[PDB]
Amino acid sequence: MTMYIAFILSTIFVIGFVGFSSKPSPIYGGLGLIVSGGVGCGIVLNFGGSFLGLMVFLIYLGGMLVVFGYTTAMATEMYPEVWVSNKTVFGAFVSGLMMEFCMVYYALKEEEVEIIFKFNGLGDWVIYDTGDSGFFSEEAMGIAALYSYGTWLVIVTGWSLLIGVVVIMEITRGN
Amino acid sequence: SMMKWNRERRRLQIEDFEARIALMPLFQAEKDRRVLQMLRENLEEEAIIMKDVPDWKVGESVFHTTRWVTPMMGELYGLRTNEEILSATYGFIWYT
Amino acid sequence: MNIMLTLLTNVTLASLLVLIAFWLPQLNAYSEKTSPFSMKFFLVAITFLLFDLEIALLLPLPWASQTNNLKTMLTMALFLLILLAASLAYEWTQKGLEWA
Amino acid sequence: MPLVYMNIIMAFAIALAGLLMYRSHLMSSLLCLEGMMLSLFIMSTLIILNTHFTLANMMPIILLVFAACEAALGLSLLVMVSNTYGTDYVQNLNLLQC
Amino acid sequence: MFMINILSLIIPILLAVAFLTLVERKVLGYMQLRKGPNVVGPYGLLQPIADALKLFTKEPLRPATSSISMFIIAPILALSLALTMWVPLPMPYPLINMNLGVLFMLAMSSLAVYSILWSGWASNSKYALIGALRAVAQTISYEVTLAIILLSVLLMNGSYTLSTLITTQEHIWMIFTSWPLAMMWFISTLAETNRAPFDLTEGESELVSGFNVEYAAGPFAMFFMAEYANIIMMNAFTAILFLGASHDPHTPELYTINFVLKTLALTITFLWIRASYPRFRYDQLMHLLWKSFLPLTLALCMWHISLPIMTASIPPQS
Amino acid sequence: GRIASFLKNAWAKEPVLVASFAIGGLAIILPSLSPYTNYAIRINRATPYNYPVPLRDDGNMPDVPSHPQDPQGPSLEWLKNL
Amino acid sequence: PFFDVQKRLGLDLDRWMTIQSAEQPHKIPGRCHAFEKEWIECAHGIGGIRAEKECKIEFDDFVECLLRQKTMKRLSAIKRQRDKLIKEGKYTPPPHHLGKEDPRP
Amino acid sequence: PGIVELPTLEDLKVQEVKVSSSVLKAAAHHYGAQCDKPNKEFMLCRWEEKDPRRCLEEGKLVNQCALDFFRQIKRHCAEPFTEYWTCIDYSGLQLFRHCRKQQAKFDECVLDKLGWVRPDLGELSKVTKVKTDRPLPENPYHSRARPEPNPEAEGDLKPAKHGSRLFFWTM
Amino acid sequence: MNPIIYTTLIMTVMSGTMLVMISSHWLLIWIGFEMNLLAMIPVLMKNFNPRATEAATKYFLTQATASMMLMMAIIINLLYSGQWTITKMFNPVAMTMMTMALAMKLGLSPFHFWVPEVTQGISLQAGLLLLTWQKLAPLSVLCQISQSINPNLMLTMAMLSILIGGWGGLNQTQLRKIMAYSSIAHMGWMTAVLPYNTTMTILNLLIYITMTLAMFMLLIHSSATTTLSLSHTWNKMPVITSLMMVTLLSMGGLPPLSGFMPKWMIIQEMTKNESIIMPTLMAMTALLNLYFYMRLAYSSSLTMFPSTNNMKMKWQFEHTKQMKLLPTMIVLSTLVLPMTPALSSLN
């Protein structure tokens, strides 16, 4: 079973996406997003991306959606909408799981599934490379090259964040 | 104090990297031999496996180029045991 | 598998305690006990986000210190930090940091 | 393409469909936006790690930097909408027509 | 045997939390000219057992009537994350050795706020919701400085690996190098753990019980255990980061003793601070961080970037 | 003169900002005039992260050594003295 | 309207990250550096229209290195037929593939 | 397309240096100092050829040289080296720092009996020349013929035959 | 909004578009789009009204979806080619997704529904920026990827845009909505020639930009947002309404006015590629645009609508602010037809 941990995680990722995509109250949506973020971190870690996946755990889960939650709390709704609360939400939730199951089964049964692209049912372990990175974390060096090579990216991103602060101030002015 | 100790630490790191450099050629030879042997075993077992299948060449390269391509994990460990596959794929990631 | 084991064990232990604390003591026999303003200061939360972004951008610095172009690396790192300080100063001076 | 790529592309498609089909709340749609961004981060990270594109391992980070900028903009708009109407309901964004 | 190691990390930490409660009570009493609990057992050693049993046998009130799933998840998440954050700590050998254990702990701390966030909301009360919101702001506000200070000090470590901190501080404590950062980091720990003078969340004097006002019996006990476990863990992180200890590879017991003693000293410092100062006003708390601390942390971060370059003391990556 | 008055007022009323600006200015300026920065660059260069791939000897490379412990090639004595 | 200001002013604003075979830190090679280098060297100065067919072999090899669809298809066929023969009972995996011999160091 | 020419099992069978990582690391400096020539030759072969198959013989020579190095160590300095690597094996990181005394003993014995001198810091990391009789690979990438470039820059510019020639415009 | 901040936001918008038109790396092009959105949103809400907030929210949602689809297309093209360079796109699905995203950014139908609403919500100056400057970046991106573009999808979107722009305008009495529908139709005209000849798209874009600049500046000068408020203008500033009539006739494409040349050259290029039915349908469908232009002209200048007594007060005063480029924009929008062969400069 440990042979397809990545696939199990990807299925959980899709399930969380169906959860927050069916639009329950933003509380449960936040829960689905949090679960999906953790699971994406798991997949990234499995592929060797410890730092990148951990970034989602902190700057995405404990970041963008940590305020998403703080926001919903300020705009409190009368009732916590759940999947079963609206027949459509529950129906779409079930259909989404069913859709995943259909493609999953087809991919496994039909060695080569083709929804919009062509996918092979072989385990993800196949695609991995047999090279050695030596005394290095390739992800770490690539990310740290943002200061040595990606100076232009640094400039543009910093300017965007400053203008984002100014923009948020201006939008929340309200005159 | 920190300056002194960090300079010494960089010296020791250079020493350890020099040791790795000294040992690297032997590891490269061993790795190349192991990869070639694993590929040969896969090819032989594959000829036994797919002899009866029609229109299947054995060991036909999937690339047009007649140049060595580093085999993926799937080629080398395709038909090994699951424990070997799990080790080769996720050992460094999981080891803690 | 070690990290997965640790996560599983911790979660199961905590959930087991929650079970023994939500249901096990709930058996004990008893009787009947009967029984928001729009925060505009949420701007602080939003500013945290844009500052957490710079936090993320700054994390690679320990490995960034290992490059050979230390001049460029230092210039860009101080550039990002000075832009963050400028953002803080702007929000401060424009009374945008109206906490509570 | 391995099945993980299929799953993540499916997740992005599902999130996109959810965003394009609002129900009442704007926050749910903004959740779908953040979710689509997660799908894109995971897909980009998997591609870059598998291909050993060392110099592109920062692209997922910049994507998230601008993902949070977009989220922040969305919340900054949502608060104003709520102030003007009392709810985040989409049906109140009705003054402009055609 | 790895499961045995997990249990060995978990159960003693819970026992330490239980007895930390008694230690806090006695220390606060003695600093107030009083004697801590001493009737229940010799010198009060059996008081935590009585407290726990009384809590568990107590009525399980629950007028939440909203998202009971959340009202149950919040204690689970809090306790689970409190136990997990202990895992990567090297004492001196970590249970799980991560290249980025530091960022892992930061992420887990950020997640742990959701426990307070949900508990207060699913309670669906007045003090609970508003108090939970004040919590989010508090933890979120100090999370920024916590990260900056941590990055600034690790610039000398050369990695986010907790284990290498022992090697880096082999000759001297890092407090000598970064004491201003140490002071700000200590205050940051105080804020993150929601301890006095930043005990605004619970804030009994102002908010009847804060986020846990609608939590009783066992779930309240789990919140208490999570709080105290976080206190001990954050003090342990401080001890590892700044007050390094000598580690003899052949006898880890010496390092373990030294580390435990330093963590105990820092926890006693936490209780001491709780006794001495009054509580900062919610507004003053944020003023102290974004307007007063955040600047100095930025300046010190620039300095700690520049110093290794201008002193040729860039630490080794490995 | 007025600058001294501004500094005194700033230190009296906003000492934290004064400390922060002083520290940031030093962090900006000092590395430029520090002699050891080039030493840090050289140290980072000297670290043998990747293998030193040998080069074919065509008989016209006096400077490149033929074997370690030969006098030709770079030296790390400066770091050892450091 | 792609004003090639980078080429006019000789500034490498973003072309460093354009390809996987460009210079990378510590000369860490890409997984498909050889194929990409060959494809670019083939498709240099001949125009896109010519490159789409006169370098199709190089591009196909590059795509195969990137995605390995054909390699995975071949391996899937091998595993299918091995399972089929095992069910029929006319195949027995060798002891070394079963783990009965120590792999070469 | 074509069949991959994997070498036979027999040709790739070589005597193996069956020593653990700590043992190799203990002797790493002197091993690099003594066995440099075959190792550098094999590395040059691997990097020029870019095919593991082409350089099997050089790998065999590297393995043989390593075995000779360890045979000499066993003959002359067996016990000090055993103590050194047992000391190194204890440390999880296999650090050199903790075993400086055993390192001194082993270095002294090896300098006396065999005359080997431990290479200094920054020495084994130097790029070195290798004199080889193997020819340089002509097309290591096995690249196809490059497509022919387009004709360009025929000659001087002259005015348009009758201007723009756009509809009714005469200029 | 503080004027320094307003200038910084406008420069950020322009810098985002410059990054879009300057970068050879897809990630940076998407970054430029993100900067454009971030800077644009507050600019749309310079004057704070509930309508301004609603327009900003709609625009943000639409552009955010477009950017997300664009980034997914970039990621897919990376997955199948491993190239970040803006060039031929090597996956048809990525090409289709990118085309949909860029069309949504441009307001091409059936992604047009947001253009009229956003234009009505925002002020005349924000509308000018939205309908002139914002079009530059996506059109640049499409021109760079023109070869990969599937002609059928682009042509269908162009024809639908022309049809819908013509239809919607007939029903509108609000000047801003009329301008938005005209913009939709002209965007369809520009994107029609994109598969065939990009220089024609650039020429049409320049002519359209001049005409819309002139029209919006005239509306700002007249301070009219409705047909009747514009009708009142003849009593105050007859020259303004006369020039408005001339610019409207140009926008309709009537010869010999400058508005004729983009349509003429587009028809030429399409016919050279054996497209005969499509240019014919586009030219005929432009008559709806011409119709509502003519109705606006009847309301404004050709016929004198009733004024109000209080206008006698405005007679005494004069316009304080002068828009320097308005006269030259009018001249270029109306009298540049004798100078088409200069369409080889942008070539």
Side-chain angles (χ1 to χ4, degrees), chain I residues 103-120:
Chain I
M104 193 184 310
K105 277 187 174 299
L106 276 188
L108 297 179
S109 74
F111 305 106
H112 73 272
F113 302 105
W114 64 265
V115 187
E117 303 162 4
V118 176
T119 305
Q120 185 61 28

PDB file of all heavy atoms in Angstrom, chain I residues 103-120:
ATOM      1  N   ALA I 103      -8.595  36.310 -23.859  1.00  0.00           N
ATOM      2  CA  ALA I 103      -9.842  36.887 -24.340  1.00  0.00           C
ATOM      3  C   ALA I 103     -10.657  37.458 -23.191  1.00  0.00           C
ATOM      4  O   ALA I 103     -11.250  38.534 -23.314  1.00  0.00           O
ATOM      5  CB  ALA I 103     -10.648  35.839 -25.100  1.00  0.00           C
ATOM      6  N   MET I 104     -10.701  36.743 -22.065  1.00  0.00           N
ATOM      7  CA  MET I 104     -11.409  37.251 -20.898  1.00  0.00           C
ATOM      8  C   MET I 104     -10.781  38.545 -20.402  1.00  0.00           C
ATOM      9  O   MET I 104     -11.489  39.476 -20.000  1.00  0.00           O
ATOM     10  CB  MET I 104     -11.416  36.199 -19.793  1.00  0.00           C
ATOM     11  CG  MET I 104     -12.379  36.489 -18.665  1.00  0.00           C
ATOM     12  SD  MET I 104     -12.263  35.279 -17.337  1.00  0.00           S
ATOM     13  CE  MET I 104     -12.379  33.752 -18.263  1.00  0.00           C
ATOM     14  N   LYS I 105      -9.450  38.620 -20.415  1.00  0.00           N
ATOM     15  CA  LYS I 105      -8.791  39.864 -20.040  1.00  0.00           C
ATOM     16  C   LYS I 105      -9.147  40.989 -21.004  1.00  0.00           C
ATOM     17  O   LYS I 105      -9.363  42.130 -20.584  1.00  0.00           O
ATOM     18  CB  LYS I 105      -7.278  39.670 -19.983  1.00  0.00           C
ATOM     19  CG  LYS I 105      -6.778  39.082 -18.679  1.00  0.00           C
ATOM     20  CD  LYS I 105      -5.264  39.075 -18.608  1.00  0.00           C
ATOM     21  CE  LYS I 105      -4.783  38.619 -17.242  1.00  0.00           C
ATOM     22  NZ  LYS I 105      -5.262  39.530 -16.171  1.00  0.00           N
ATOM     23  N   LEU I 106      -9.216  40.687 -22.300  1.00  0.00           N
ATOM     24  CA  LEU I 106      -9.547  41.699 -23.295  1.00  0.00           C
ATOM     25  C   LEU I 106     -11.021  42.057 -23.317  1.00  0.00           C
ATOM     26  O   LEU I 106     -11.393  43.043 -23.961  1.00  0.00           O
ATOM     27  CB  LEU I 106      -9.139  41.232 -24.691  1.00  0.00           C
ATOM     28  CG  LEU I 106      -7.691  41.458 -25.097  1.00  0.00           C
ATOM     29  CD1 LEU I 106      -7.508  41.133 -26.565  1.00  0.00           C
ATOM     30  CD2 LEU I 106      -7.284  42.888 -24.804  1.00  0.00           C
ATOM     31  N   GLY I 107     -11.868  41.287 -22.647  1.00  0.00           N
ATOM     32  CA  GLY I 107     -13.290  41.519 -22.735  1.00  0.00           C
ATOM     33  C   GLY I 107     -13.933  41.005 -23.999  1.00  0.00           C
ATOM     34  O   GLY I 107     -15.065  41.389 -24.302  1.00  0.00           O
ATOM     35  N   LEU I 108     -13.252  40.142 -24.747  1.00  0.00           N
ATOM     36  CA  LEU I 108     -13.857  39.538 -25.926  1.00  0.00           C
ATOM     37  C   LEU I 108     -15.005  38.633 -25.510  1.00  0.00           C
ATOM     38  O   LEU I 108     -14.885  37.860 -24.556  1.00  0.00           O
ATOM     39  CB  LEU I 108     -12.823  38.733 -26.707  1.00  0.00           C
ATOM     40  CG  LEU I 108     -11.637  39.469 -27.315  1.00  0.00           C
ATOM     41  CD1 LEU I 108     -10.745  38.469 -28.016  1.00  0.00           C
ATOM     42  CD2 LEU I 108     -12.107  40.538 -28.280  1.00  0.00           C
ATOM     43  N   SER I 109     -16.124  38.734 -26.219  1.00  0.00           N
ATOM     44  CA  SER I 109     -17.253  37.868 -25.935  1.00  0.00           C
ATOM     45  C   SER I 109     -16.886  36.420 -26.262  1.00  0.00           C
ATOM     46  O   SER I 109     -16.038  36.168 -27.122  1.00  0.00           O
ATOM     47  CB  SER I 109     -18.476  38.304 -26.732  1.00  0.00           C
ATOM     48  OG  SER I 109     -18.344  37.960 -28.093  1.00  0.00           O
ATOM     49  N   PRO I 110     -17.496  35.445 -25.580  1.00  0.00           N
ATOM     50  CA  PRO I 110     -18.539  35.551 -24.559  1.00  0.00           C
ATOM     51  C   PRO I 110     -17.969  35.781 -23.177  1.00  0.00           C
ATOM     52  O   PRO I 110     -18.462  35.236 -22.198  1.00  0.00           O
ATOM     53  CB  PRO I 110     -19.253  34.190 -24.637  1.00  0.00           C
ATOM     54  CG  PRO I 110     -18.660  33.473 -25.829  1.00  0.00           C
ATOM     55  CD  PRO I 110     -17.291  34.045 -25.958  1.00  0.00           C
ATOM     56  N   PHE I 111     -16.915  36.576 -23.065  1.00  0.00           N
ATOM     57  CA  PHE I 111     -16.415  37.029 -21.778  1.00  0.00           C
ATOM     58  C   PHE I 111     -16.549  38.541 -21.674  1.00  0.00           C
ATOM     59  O   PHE I 111     -15.767  39.203 -20.994  1.00  0.00           O
ATOM     60  CB  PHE I 111     -14.972  36.578 -21.570  1.00  0.00           C
ATOM     61  CG  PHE I 111     -14.779  35.098 -21.724  1.00  0.00           C
ATOM     62  CD1 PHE I 111     -14.156  34.579 -22.838  1.00  0.00           C
ATOM     63  CD2 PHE I 111     -15.219  34.226 -20.748  1.00  0.00           C
ATOM     64  CE1 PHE I 111     -13.979  33.223 -22.977  1.00  0.00           C
ATOM     65  CE2 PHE I 111     -15.046  32.869 -20.885  1.00  0.00           C
ATOM     66  CZ  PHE I 111     -14.425  32.370 -22.001  1.00  0.00           C
ATOM     67  N   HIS I 112     -17.550  39.088 -22.356  1.00  0.00           N
ATOM     68  CA  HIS I 112     -17.752  40.522 -22.470  1.00  0.00           C
ATOM     69  C   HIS I 112     -18.608  41.105 -21.358  1.00  0.00           C
ATOM     70  O   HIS I 112     -18.617  42.327 -21.187  1.00  0.00           O
ATOM     71  CB  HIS I 112     -18.427  40.842 -23.801  1.00  0.00           C
ATOM     72  CG  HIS I 112     -19.871  40.453 -23.840  1.00  0.00           C
ATOM     73  ND1 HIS I 112     -20.294  39.202 -24.229  1.00  0.00           N
ATOM     74  CD2 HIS I 112     -20.989  41.141 -23.512  1.00  0.00           C
ATOM     75  CE1 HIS I 112     -21.611  39.139 -24.152  1.00  0.00           C
ATOM     76  NE2 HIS I 112     -22.057  40.303 -23.718  1.00  0.00           N
ATOM     77  N   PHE I 113     -19.317  40.267 -20.600  1.00  0.00           N
ATOM     78  CA  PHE I 113     -20.385  40.765 -19.738  1.00  0.00           C
ATOM     79  C   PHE I 113     -19.876  41.750 -18.695  1.00  0.00           C
ATOM     80  O   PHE I 113     -20.646  42.581 -18.202  1.00  0.00           O
ATOM     81  CB  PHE I 113     -21.089  39.596 -19.059  1.00  0.00           C
ATOM     82  CG  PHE I 113     -21.675  38.606 -20.020  1.00  0.00           C
ATOM     83  CD1 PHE I 113     -21.073  37.379 -20.224  1.00  0.00           C
ATOM     84  CD2 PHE I 113     -22.828  38.902 -20.717  1.00  0.00           C
ATOM     85  CE1 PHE I 113     -21.613  36.467 -21.107  1.00  0.00           C
ATOM     86  CE2 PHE I 113     -23.372  37.994 -21.599  1.00  0.00           C
ATOM     87  CZ  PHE I 113     -22.762  36.776 -21.794  1.00  0.00           C
ATOM     88  N   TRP I 114     -18.592  41.681 -18.346  1.00  0.00           N
ATOM     89  CA  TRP I 114     -18.075  42.547 -17.296  1.00  0.00           C
ATOM     90  C   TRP I 114     -17.709  43.933 -17.809  1.00  0.00           C
ATOM     91  O   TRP I 114     -17.690  44.889 -17.027  1.00  0.00           O
ATOM     92  CB  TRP I 114     -16.864  41.900 -16.629  1.00  0.00           C
ATOM     93  CG  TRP I 114     -15.696  41.709 -17.530  1.00  0.00           C
ATOM     94  CD1 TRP I 114     -15.375  40.587 -18.222  1.00  0.00           C
ATOM     95  CD2 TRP I 114     -14.680  42.670 -17.827  1.00  0.00           C
ATOM     96  NE1 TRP I 114     -14.222  40.786 -18.938  1.00  0.00           N
ATOM     97  CE2 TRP I 114     -13.776  42.059 -18.711  1.00  0.00           C
ATOM     98  CE3 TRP I 114     -14.448  43.988 -17.433  1.00  0.00           C
ATOM     99  CZ2 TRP I 114     -12.663  42.718 -19.209  1.00  0.00           C
ATOM    100  CZ3 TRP I 114     -13.343  44.641 -17.928  1.00  0.00           C
ATOM    101  CH2 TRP I 114     -12.463  44.007 -18.807  1.00  0.00           C
ATOM    102  N   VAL I 115     -17.404  44.065 -19.100  1.00  0.00           N
ATOM    103  CA  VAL I 115     -16.952  45.353 -19.626  1.00  0.00           C
ATOM    104  C   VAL I 115     -17.999  46.448 -19.460  1.00  0.00           C
ATOM    105  O   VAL I 115     -17.661  47.519 -18.927  1.00  0.00           O
ATOM    106  CB  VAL I 115     -16.492  45.195 -21.087  1.00  0.00           C
ATOM    107  CG1 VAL I 115     -15.853  46.481 -21.582  1.00  0.00           C
ATOM    108  CG2 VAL I 115     -15.533  44.024 -21.216  1.00  0.00           C
ATOM    109  N   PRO I 116     -19.257  46.271 -19.886  1.00  0.00           N
ATOM    110  CA  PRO I 116     -20.224  47.367 -19.717  1.00  0.00           C
ATOM    111  C   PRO I 116     -20.443  47.744 -18.269  1.00  0.00           C
ATOM    112  O   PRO I 116     -20.501  48.935 -17.937  1.00  0.00           O
ATOM    113  CB  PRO I 116     -21.504  46.804 -20.348  1.00  0.00           C
ATOM    114  CG  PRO I 116     -21.053  45.703 -21.223  1.00  0.00           C
ATOM    115  CD  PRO I 116     -19.882  45.106 -20.532  1.00  0.00           C
ATOM    116  N   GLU I 117     -20.532  46.749 -17.390  1.00  0.00           N
ATOM    117  CA  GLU I 117     -20.799  47.019 -15.984  1.00  0.00           C
ATOM    118  C   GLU I 117     -19.640  47.766 -15.338  1.00  0.00           C
ATOM    119  O   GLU I 117     -19.842  48.768 -14.643  1.00  0.00           O
ATOM    120  CB  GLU I 117     -21.081  45.705 -15.263  1.00  0.00           C
ATOM    121  CG  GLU I 117     -22.230  44.935 -15.877  1.00  0.00           C
ATOM    122  CD  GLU I 117     -22.242  43.488 -15.464  1.00  0.00           C
ATOM    123  OE1 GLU I 117     -21.398  43.107 -14.632  1.00  0.00           O
ATOM    124  OE2 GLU I 117     -23.087  42.726 -15.975  1.00  0.00           O
ATOM    125  N   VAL I 118     -18.412  47.299 -15.567  1.00  0.00           N
ATOM    126  CA  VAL I 118     -17.261  47.967 -14.973  1.00  0.00           C
ATOM    127  C   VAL I 118     -17.129  49.382 -15.515  1.00  0.00           C
ATOM    128  O   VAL I 118     -16.853  50.323 -14.762  1.00  0.00           O
ATOM    129  CB  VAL I 118     -15.979  47.149 -15.197  1.00  0.00           C
ATOM    130  CG1 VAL I 118     -14.783  47.900 -14.655  1.00  0.00           C
ATOM    131  CG2 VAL I 118     -16.092  45.811 -14.506  1.00  0.00           C
ATOM    132  N   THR I 119     -17.324  49.562 -16.825  1.00  0.00           N
ATOM    133  CA  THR I 119     -17.205  50.898 -17.397  1.00  0.00           C
ATOM    134  C   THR I 119     -18.256  51.839 -16.827  1.00  0.00           C
ATOM    135  O   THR I 119     -17.964  53.007 -16.540  1.00  0.00           O
ATOM    136  CB  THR I 119     -17.315  50.835 -18.917  1.00  0.00           C
ATOM    137  OG1 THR I 119     -16.339  49.919 -19.424  1.00  0.00           O
ATOM    138  CG2 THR I 119     -17.066  52.203 -19.521  1.00  0.00           C
ATOM    139  N   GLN I 120     -19.489  51.356 -16.654  1.00  0.00           N
ATOM    140  CA  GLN I 120     -20.519  52.202 -16.067  1.00  0.00           C
ATOM    141  C   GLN I 120     -20.195  52.545 -14.623  1.00  0.00           C
ATOM    142  O   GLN I 120     -20.433  53.675 -14.180  1.00  0.00           O
ATOM    143  CB  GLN I 120     -21.884  51.527 -16.158  1.00  0.00           C
ATOM    144  CG  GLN I 120     -23.025  52.399 -15.670  1.00  0.00           C
ATOM    145  CD  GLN I 120     -23.174  53.673 -16.481  1.00  0.00           C
ATOM    146  OE1 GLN I 120     -22.820  53.720 -17.659  1.00  0.00           O
ATOM    147  NE2 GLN I 120     -23.699  54.715 -15.850  1.00  0.00           N
TER     148      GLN I 120
END
